[PDB]
Structures are given as C-alpha cells and as structure tokens.
C-alpha cells in the first residue's frame, strides 16, 4: 500500500538561494536579564583539532574523566563598536532613530565606509534621550566592524561591519553603557562578552557548492536497481500528480545549494585564549597559522576556513552553564596525514 515516509529535506530553510550578505545577520537577540552588555561578537574560522577535556557534566557517570572533544578554532581578535544606533517604537514596528559616532577610526575602515568627517554626536544623543523621555525608545544596538588586518591568514583588510544589540538592566543604564563603550573607541573583546563554558549561537554563511541535484540538495534517493540503468540515475520520479496541473514549489528540484545563512544553536565555548596554543603543525590546511586571540568552539561551525562567523549568547540553551572547563590537552598534530 506504499509505506509512508517523511518528505525529503526541510521546507524551513528556503528559498534555497544565494545569501544576500556573506556577513550573517541575527534575527533574534537574547533577553535583557543581567547587566548592560553587547549581545554578540565575531571572528574568522580557521579549522579544526581535538581537545581532551574533563567531564564537566554533574549528571554524567563519567563526570571527572578524560574526554576527547572535537573543536573548531576561530580567530577572534578585538572588534570596534564605532556607533550607537537607537530605534524608536512606531505603529509599523521598530525604526532607526539616530546614531552616535566617534572620531577615532581604524586606518582601514574607509575600504567599506564613507567615514564621518562632520558629525554632531551630542544632538543625536539628545534626540535619543528625548525620545526615551517620551517613552518611544525601542532598543539600542551598536554598529560594529572587524579588524581582518589583525588576522594574517585572512587576506581581506576590508572590515566586516555588522550591527549587534545591547541588552542591559534598564534602558537608561544600558544606554549609558553603550554611549561609554563608543566614546572611547568602541574597542572590545570576546572576554568582555563571553566566558569559557557558556553556550553561544554561531551564525554563518555555509560553504557554497553551486548548483546541485535533488539527491545531494534534498537527499532524495537515486534510481534503484534496473531503473538506475535506463537513462535516469539522479532524477526524481515525477514533478507531481496530474492534478493540480502545475509543479508545486515543495518538490525537490535542482538549484543553488550551499552559501546560505545558518544559525547553529547552543555551541559550547570550550575556551577563549590567545597565542598559538591551538595551531596545527604545518599550518591549518588552506588557512594558516594561529597566533593571537582565539575561541575554541565545540564541534562544527557553518562556513569554510577564512569565513566570518558571528556569536551570540544562546537564546534557547537546554543546559545550565558549566564555567571554565578543564582542558588537559589540545592537539597540535598536523592536519595533513
């Protein structure tokens, strides 16, 4: 009677098209719980190695024992919150009100922007506070950019600009917290936002693969047995029934596969350090040598080596934070062999 079977692939990550921005954009943010702070950071994927860890889980029978864990190494140097954007609550949703900038700009920010020559910070600040007084102040986020120049393995110098939100105690306090960060020079580090052991949400634009067939793109079957030898091997049975007389968008077809934005949830931050403790012998294949500020993320992260990846405090973690895990060993063995 033809056995049932779930459809091939998910309909939740579509359309399966090329991403608009190589730099990921979070469409959600963590809640305003603790003290005022920036709700995200970024870095550049380098590669993978394994780490030996002590079982941190109190509910595990193996608690306290050695444990080998896969880790993706990401070079996460300091970023710079160059401006403070305030949104106002309008009858059509949130809308950008104004921005408060600075004067101290990184030598190569103009490779992307039309850096401000004449700006009035105070006025914008005033407008933001007046709106706040009126009770129309939506949320507050900081314009941020990376320093690719700080990462040798990454060829680009043109900084990746992205807006990150600030979640704080009160609106009045996080506003101040924001303004302060910016005034200095907006310089901040992964330490400032995260701590080893916390779970982060890593967003990134996956490894591109160009056009691919249904079999790879949607996980449909290959023609089987005799059917496989008739002239059809990797094409689905049919595009749909006689009626409705049209091909439904839900049928697995050929197209752009890869180079899409993805936001992987609950990624444990095994360790945030600095130096060359993680670099592989002979260099990370197709990347290079890591000798600077870095983050060790448990498991896989979307994207190819050199790609920009964004961090965010897990918006829906399942486990309780188990701070600063014990790292008894980090493999430095060559990734060639």
């Amino acid at each position: 009677p033809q056995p049932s079977r779930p459809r091939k692939g998910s309909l939740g990550f579509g359309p399966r098209k090329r991403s608009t921005s190589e730099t990921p954009r979070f469409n959600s943010w963590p809640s305003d719980d603790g003290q005022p702070g920036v709700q995200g950071f970024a870095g550049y994927k380098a590669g993978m190695t394994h780490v030996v860890l002590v079982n941190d889980e109190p509910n595990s029978p193996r608690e306290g024992m050695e444990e080998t864990v896969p880790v993706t190494v990401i070079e996460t140097p300091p970023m710079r919150a160059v401006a403070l954007r305030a949104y106002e609550d309008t009858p059509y949703g949130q809308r950008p009100l104004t921005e408060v900038w600075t004067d101290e700009f990184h030598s190569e920010l103009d490779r992307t922007l039309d850096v401000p020559e004449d700006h009035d910070p105070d006025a914008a600040e005033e407008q933001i506070r007046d709106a706040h007084e009126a009770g129309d102040l939506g949320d507050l986020r900081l314009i941020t950019h990376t320093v690719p120049d700080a990462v040798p393995s990454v060829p680009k110098k043109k900084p990746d600009v992205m807006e990150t939100r600030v979640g704080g105690g009160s609106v009045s306090d996080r506003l101040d917290h924001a303004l302060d960060i910016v005034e200095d020079g907006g310089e901040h580090a992964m330490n400032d936002i995260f701590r080893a052991g916390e779970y982060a949400d890593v967003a990134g634009v996956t490894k591109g693969k160009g056009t691919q067939g249904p079999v790879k793109r949607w996980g449909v079957q290959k023609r089987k047995g005799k059917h496989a030898r008739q002239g059809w091997r990797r094409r689905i049975g049919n595009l749909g029934p006689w009626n409705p007389s049209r091909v439904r968008s839900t049928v697995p077809q050929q197209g752009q596969t890869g180079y899409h934005q993805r936001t992987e949830l609950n990624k444990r931050l095994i360790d945030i350090g600095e130096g060359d403790e993680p670099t592989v012998d002979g260099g990370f294949v197709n990347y290079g040598e890591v000798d600077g500020p870095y983050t060790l993320v448990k498991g896989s992260v979307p994207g190819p080596d050199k790609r920009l990846v964004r961090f965010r405090p897990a918006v829906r973690p399942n486990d309780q934070p188990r701070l600063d895990p014990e790292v008894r060993y980090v493999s430095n063995e060559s990734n060639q062999g």
Binding site: R5, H50, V52, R62, M65, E67, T68, Q221
Partner: protein, 132 residues
Amino acid sequence: MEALGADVTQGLEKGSLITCADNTGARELKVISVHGYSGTKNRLPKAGLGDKITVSVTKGTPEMRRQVLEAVVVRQRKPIRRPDGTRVKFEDNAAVIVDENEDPRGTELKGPIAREVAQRFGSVASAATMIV
C-alpha cells in the same frame, strides 16, 4: 536502555549470519529483528554491538537448529568509538543466546567481549573470560 558509553556504527542487518559465542549447541546465528528498533522506508533494519537481537539458529546441534531465540551482540567487525576517541573493532561478529531474564542460555562464553556490553547485560558480563 542504559547508555552504552560508546558510539556504535551498526555493522549488522536483518538476515546477517553471525557467530554464537557460547556452548549452547548453536554455532551460527541469523539476525531476525532488533529489539526496540523501528526503521524507515527501504532501510534494512540495523543491529550493532550492545543490541538485543532476535535470532534464528542456522547451524549447530539438531536440537538447537531451526529455533528462534533472543541474543545479545557481543562482537562486530565494524568499529565503535569510545569517549577517549579511540575506535575499537573485532575479528568477527558475534552474539550470545539469552533467555527472558537476559541470562546467558549456555554455561561458557567463547572468545573476548566488549566492556560496554557489561553495563547492559551483567549476567552475560560476569560469564566472560575476556573483556576488552
């Protein structure tokens, strides 16, 4: 069931002919079903080390031959992973005939056994000469 404490790539399928690691009188076993398992369309039901499979007696004494008994997978050629990363694999695929209480039917267990099997089937464990 209770966690194996090891990741397993099932190396057997329904219809697979394996070795009966005991003195029951049954030499060769044929996998029929995998307890607690439900597959998916076209997928041939898979069994691995640490599973309680249903078996048919292919070879052995006329008495045991052609019977349908339950058993536990003790060894398998396809590797398995341990917490420390290392893979572990055996020289053959083998199971031990078992009763309703998960107690070995026979008296003696031939060949070595996986340590992970112990956490699940104690009576089978405390009947093994070697535990790797």
